[PDB]
Amino acid sequence: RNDILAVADWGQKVSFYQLSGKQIGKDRALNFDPCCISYFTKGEYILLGGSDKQVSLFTKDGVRLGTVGEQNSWVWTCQAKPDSNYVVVGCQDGTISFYQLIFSTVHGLYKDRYAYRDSMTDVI
Amino acid sequence: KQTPRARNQLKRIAKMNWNAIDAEEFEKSWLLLADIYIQSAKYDMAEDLLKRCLRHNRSCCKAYEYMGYIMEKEQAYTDAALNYEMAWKYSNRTNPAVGYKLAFNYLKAKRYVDSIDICHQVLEAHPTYPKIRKDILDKARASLR
């Protein structure tokens, strides 16, 4: 079985474990206590919030991609809309924020060749 | 250790009024007199002098720390937390003990997340500072739900 469990510890790390108990890769050191780990619709990106008063987007491997929102308290939950780029962030202050994530097209073209950005970390 | 002589001398000093040239000497004198009073358990007049010093200067870290200790003695956890937070901010978080007291006061006031934040700040400042992982951070973590 090829299943991945993303784990957000309070030792400030995120791990990825297989169903057999073996780990996938190394840990990803964090400088904040995580309180919410989730996924997008097709499981392509990861949402991470917590002790940092902000929400971050990560690759499915755990490489940080950018900041979704900057909040004023701990983000206790960082879910995402079931079939869209919208994300909703609820924090301890009681604030609920509904962001729409927009991804910029990064590409170049020369005559008969066209390079573009795929999966936010690859060049096709 | 000529403490009574110092107490009488500072009683005399506090009688004179503050001036624009010896402000720091005045603040040191008032702080030492507050020290003597707190040692002698004269909380009221020490509080009065500390309020005086804070009136004449709004960023005296030691005065705020003394006020936090006084409010702790009366279990004024909200006021003690505010004073300790102010002292922690103005000291540029170079005194781990102040952070310890402040996190403890948040913990007692049932403000667990702020206590955890201050504990993280202290441990980042000093990873080896003991008695904070268990006496404060662990207890705050256990009380979240």
Short mmCIF file of C-alpha atoms in Angstrom, two decimals:
data_model
loop_
_atom_site.label_atom_id
_atom_site.label_comp_id
_atom_site.label_asym_id
_atom_site.label_seq_id
_atom_site.Cartn_x
_atom_site.Cartn_y
_atom_site.Cartn_z
CA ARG A 1 0.00 0.00 0.00
CA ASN A 2 1.29 3.44 -1.03
CA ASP A 3 -0.22 5.80 1.53
CA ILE A 4 1.34 8.91 3.08
CA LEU A 5 0.42 10.31 6.49
CA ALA A 6 1.57 13.87 7.05
CA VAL A 7 2.39 14.37 10.74
CA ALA A 8 2.66 17.78 12.44
CA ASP A 9 4.45 17.31 15.77
CA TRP A 10 4.90 19.74 18.62
CA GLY A 11 8.62 19.23 18.43
CA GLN A 12 8.21 21.62 15.49
CA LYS A 13 8.60 19.18 12.60
CA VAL A 14 6.50 17.68 9.83
CA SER A 15 7.10 14.04 8.93
CA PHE A 16 5.64 11.76 6.27
CA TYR A 17 5.04 8.15 7.23
CA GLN A 18 4.00 5.13 5.20
CA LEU A 19 1.29 2.78 6.42
CA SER A 20 4.00 0.25 7.33
CA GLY A 21 5.58 2.64 9.84
CA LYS A 22 8.62 3.42 7.68
CA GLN A 23 9.35 7.10 7.23
CA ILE A 24 9.54 8.91 3.89
CA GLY A 25 12.58 11.13 3.63
CA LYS A 26 13.84 13.28 6.46
CA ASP A 27 11.93 15.65 8.71
CA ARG A 28 11.31 19.29 7.84
CA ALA A 29 12.53 21.51 10.66
CA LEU A 30 10.07 24.21 11.68
CA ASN A 31 10.51 27.21 13.96
CA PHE A 32 6.87 27.23 15.08
CA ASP A 33 4.45 24.85 16.76
CA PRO A 34 2.10 23.40 14.12
CA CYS A 35 -1.60 23.22 14.87
CA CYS A 36 -3.14 22.30 11.49
CA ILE A 37 -1.92 20.23 8.55
CA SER A 38 -4.16 19.57 5.56
CA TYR A 39 -4.24 19.15 1.80
CA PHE A 40 -5.87 20.56 -1.31
CA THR A 41 -8.51 18.73 -3.33
CA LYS A 42 -6.17 16.47 -5.32
CA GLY A 43 -3.51 16.37 -2.59
CA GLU A 44 -0.98 18.45 -4.52
CA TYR A 45 -0.16 21.10 -1.88
CA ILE A 46 -0.13 21.23 1.92
CA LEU A 47 -1.41 23.89 4.31
CA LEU A 48 0.43 24.53 7.58
CA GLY A 49 -0.46 26.91 10.39
CA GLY A 50 -0.01 27.22 14.11
CA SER A 51 2.20 29.08 16.57
CA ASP A 52 3.33 31.39 13.80
CA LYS A 53 0.47 33.85 13.29
CA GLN A 54 0.33 32.92 9.62
CA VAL A 55 -0.53 30.14 7.18
CA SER A 56 1.97 28.66 4.74
CA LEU A 57 1.68 26.59 1.58
CA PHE A 58 4.04 23.65 1.13
CA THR A 59 4.80 21.19 -1.61
CA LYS A 60 3.58 17.66 -1.00
CA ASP A 61 7.22 16.87 -0.18
CA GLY A 62 7.27 19.65 2.44
CA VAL A 63 9.24 22.38 0.65
CA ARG A 64 7.87 25.78 1.63
CA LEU A 65 6.28 27.67 -1.26
CA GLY A 66 4.91 30.88 0.23
CA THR A 67 2.62 32.60 2.70
CA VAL A 68 -1.17 32.37 2.40
CA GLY A 69 -2.18 34.79 5.13
CA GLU A 70 -0.61 36.72 7.99
CA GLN A 71 -2.81 36.63 11.10
CA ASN A 72 -2.81 38.16 14.58
CA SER A 73 -2.97 34.96 16.65
CA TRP A 74 -2.43 31.21 16.50
CA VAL A 75 -4.07 29.53 13.52
CA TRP A 76 -5.96 26.62 15.06
CA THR A 77 -7.29 25.32 11.73
CA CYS A 78 -6.23 25.81 8.12
CA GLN A 79 -8.64 23.82 5.96
CA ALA A 80 -9.20 24.38 2.23
CA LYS A 81 -12.29 24.50 0.05
CA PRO A 82 -13.17 21.00 -1.23
CA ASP A 83 -12.87 21.77 -4.95
CA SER A 84 -11.30 25.22 -5.34
CA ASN A 85 -8.24 27.30 -4.52
CA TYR A 86 -10.11 28.98 -1.66
CA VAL A 87 -8.77 28.45 1.85
CA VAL A 88 -10.32 29.38 5.19
CA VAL A 89 -8.29 30.21 8.30
CA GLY A 90 -9.69 30.35 11.83
CA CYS A 91 -7.48 31.68 14.60
CA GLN A 92 -7.64 32.03 18.37
CA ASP A 93 -8.62 35.70 18.11
CA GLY A 94 -11.88 34.46 16.60
CA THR A 95 -10.96 35.79 13.17
CA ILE A 96 -12.06 33.77 10.15
CA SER A 97 -10.47 34.69 6.83
CA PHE A 98 -11.32 33.35 3.37
CA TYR A 99 -8.46 33.66 0.89
CA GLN A 100 -8.49 32.88 -2.81
CA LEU A 101 -5.11 31.49 -3.87
CA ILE A 102 -3.86 32.66 -7.27
CA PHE A 103 -0.87 31.08 -9.01
CA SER A 104 1.10 33.21 -11.46
CA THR A 105 2.01 31.79 -14.86
CA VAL A 106 5.80 31.56 -15.08
CA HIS A 107 6.92 30.72 -18.59
CA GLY A 108 9.13 31.58 -21.51
CA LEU A 109 8.96 30.88 -25.21
CA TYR A 110 11.54 31.06 -27.99
CA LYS A 111 10.36 30.20 -31.50
CA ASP A 112 9.53 26.49 -31.28
CA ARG A 113 10.35 25.90 -27.60
CA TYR A 114 8.14 26.70 -24.61
CA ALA A 115 9.20 26.28 -20.98
CA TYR A 116 6.68 26.61 -18.17
CA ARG A 117 6.41 25.98 -14.44
CA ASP A 118 4.76 22.68 -13.49
CA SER A 119 3.79 21.66 -9.94
CA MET A 120 5.41 24.88 -8.63
CA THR A 121 8.86 23.24 -8.51
CA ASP A 122 9.48 21.69 -11.95
CA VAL A 123 10.26 23.18 -15.36
CA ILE A 124 8.64 21.58 -18.40
CA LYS B 1 24.74 46.00 54.99
CA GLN B 2 24.15 49.35 56.74
CA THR B 3 20.54 48.94 55.69
CA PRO B 4 18.73 51.21 58.22
CA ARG B 5 21.10 54.07 57.41
CA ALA B 6 20.35 53.59 53.71
CA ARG B 7 16.61 53.53 54.45
CA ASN B 8 16.82 56.81 56.37
CA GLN B 9 18.99 58.38 53.65
CA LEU B 10 16.54 57.40 50.91
CA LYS B 11 13.66 58.68 53.03
CA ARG B 12 15.49 62.01 53.06
CA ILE B 13 16.23 61.82 49.32
CA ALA B 14 12.63 61.12 48.31
CA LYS B 15 11.57 64.36 50.03
CA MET B 16 13.37 66.50 47.46
CA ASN B 17 11.64 67.02 44.13
CA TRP B 18 12.75 65.66 40.77
CA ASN B 19 14.81 67.88 38.46
CA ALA B 20 15.87 67.78 34.82
CA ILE B 21 19.60 67.31 35.54
CA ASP B 22 19.75 64.44 38.09
CA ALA B 23 16.91 62.33 36.69
CA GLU B 24 18.88 59.08 36.52
CA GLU B 25 20.24 59.54 40.05
CA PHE B 26 16.66 60.15 41.19
CA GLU B 27 15.50 56.97 39.46
CA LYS B 28 18.29 54.90 41.01
CA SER B 29 17.46 56.35 44.44
CA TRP B 30 13.74 55.61 44.09
CA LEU B 31 14.49 52.09 42.83
CA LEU B 32 16.78 51.36 45.78
CA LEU B 33 14.20 52.72 48.22
CA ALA B 34 11.56 50.49 46.61
CA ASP B 35 13.99 47.59 47.04
CA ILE B 36 14.36 48.39 50.74
CA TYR B 37 10.59 48.70 51.21
CA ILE B 38 9.85 45.42 49.42
CA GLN B 39 12.50 43.74 51.57
CA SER B 40 10.82 45.21 54.67
CA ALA B 41 7.36 44.22 53.30
CA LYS B 42 6.27 47.86 52.90
CA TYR B 43 4.41 47.17 49.68
CA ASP B 44 2.21 50.29 49.73
CA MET B 45 4.87 53.01 49.81
CA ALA B 46 7.14 50.98 47.52
CA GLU B 47 4.27 50.86 45.03
CA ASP B 48 3.80 54.61 45.43
CA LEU B 49 7.47 55.33 44.75
CA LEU B 50 7.52 52.95 41.78
CA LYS B 51 4.49 54.72 40.30
CA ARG B 52 6.36 57.99 40.87
CA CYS B 53 9.41 56.68 39.00
CA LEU B 54 7.26 55.40 36.14
CA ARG B 55 5.53 58.78 36.00
CA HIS B 56 8.89 60.49 35.56
CA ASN B 57 10.09 57.87 33.05
CA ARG B 58 7.90 55.55 30.98
CA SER B 59 10.54 52.96 30.04
CA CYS B 60 12.17 52.00 33.36
CA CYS B 61 12.41 48.22 33.05
CA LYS B 62 13.33 47.66 36.70
CA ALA B 63 10.32 49.65 37.92
CA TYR B 64 7.98 47.56 35.78
CA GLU B 65 9.60 44.36 37.06
CA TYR B 66 9.12 45.52 40.66
CA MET B 67 5.48 46.35 39.93
CA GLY B 68 4.98 42.91 38.43
CA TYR B 69 6.46 41.31 41.54
CA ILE B 70 4.19 43.41 43.76
CA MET B 71 1.09 42.44 41.78
CA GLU B 72 2.22 38.81 42.00
CA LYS B 73 2.39 39.14 45.78
CA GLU B 74 -1.29 40.18 45.72
CA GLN B 75 -2.12 37.62 42.99
CA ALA B 76 -2.96 40.44 40.56
CA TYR B 77 -2.15 38.05 37.74
CA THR B 78 -3.53 40.36 35.05
CA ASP B 79 -1.69 43.43 36.36
CA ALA B 80 1.44 41.41 37.12
CA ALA B 81 1.32 39.94 33.62
CA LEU B 82 0.98 43.40 32.08
CA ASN B 83 3.91 44.81 34.06
CA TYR B 84 6.10 41.77 33.37
CA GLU B 85 5.24 41.99 29.67
CA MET B 86 6.20 45.66 29.59
CA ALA B 87 9.49 44.96 31.35
CA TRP B 88 10.17 42.02 29.04
CA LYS B 89 9.57 44.23 26.00
CA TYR B 90 11.70 47.17 27.15
CA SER B 91 14.61 44.96 28.23
CA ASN B 92 14.90 43.59 24.67
CA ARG B 93 14.28 40.13 26.18
CA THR B 94 17.81 39.78 27.53
CA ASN B 95 16.67 38.65 31.01
CA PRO B 96 15.31 35.07 30.94
CA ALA B 97 14.06 35.27 34.54
CA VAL B 98 11.64 38.06 33.63
CA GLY B 99 10.30 35.92 30.81
CA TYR B 100 9.93 33.04 33.25
CA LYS B 101 7.88 35.18 35.62
CA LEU B 102 5.79 36.56 32.76
CA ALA B 103 5.01 33.12 31.32
CA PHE B 104 4.12 31.89 34.81
CA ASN B 105 1.75 34.83 35.29
CA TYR B 106 0.06 34.11 31.95
CA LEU B 107 -0.27 30.46 32.97
CA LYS B 108 -1.89 31.35 36.29
CA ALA B 109 -4.23 33.80 34.56
CA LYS B 110 -5.42 30.88 32.37
CA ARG B 111 -3.92 32.47 29.23
CA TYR B 112 -2.23 29.36 27.89
CA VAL B 113 -1.28 30.42 24.36
CA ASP B 114 0.46 33.61 25.50
CA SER B 115 2.32 31.60 28.14
CA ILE B 116 3.47 29.16 25.44
CA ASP B 117 4.59 32.08 23.26
CA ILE B 118 6.65 33.61 26.07
CA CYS B 119 8.13 30.20 26.89
CA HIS B 120 9.17 29.77 23.26
CA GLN B 121 10.73 33.24 23.28
CA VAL B 122 12.69 32.46 26.46
CA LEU B 123 13.88 29.08 25.19
CA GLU B 124 14.95 30.61 21.88
CA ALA B 125 16.84 33.23 23.90
CA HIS B 126 18.28 30.51 26.17
CA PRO B 127 17.81 26.85 25.15
CA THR B 128 19.39 25.73 28.44
CA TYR B 129 17.24 27.81 30.82
CA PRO B 130 15.76 25.12 33.08
CA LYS B 131 12.51 24.85 35.06
CA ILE B 132 10.58 26.27 32.09
CA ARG B 133 9.88 23.20 29.93
CA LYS B 134 8.01 21.39 32.72
CA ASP B 135 6.96 23.96 35.34
CA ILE B 136 5.39 26.26 32.74
CA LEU B 137 5.37 25.04 29.14
CA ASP B 138 4.24 21.47 29.78
CA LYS B 139 1.50 22.52 32.20
CA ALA B 140 0.22 25.16 29.77
CA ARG B 141 0.23 22.60 26.94
CA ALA B 142 -1.70 20.08 29.04
CA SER B 143 -4.41 22.64 29.89
CA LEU B 144 -5.35 23.65 26.33
CA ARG B 145 -8.42 21.41 26.13
#
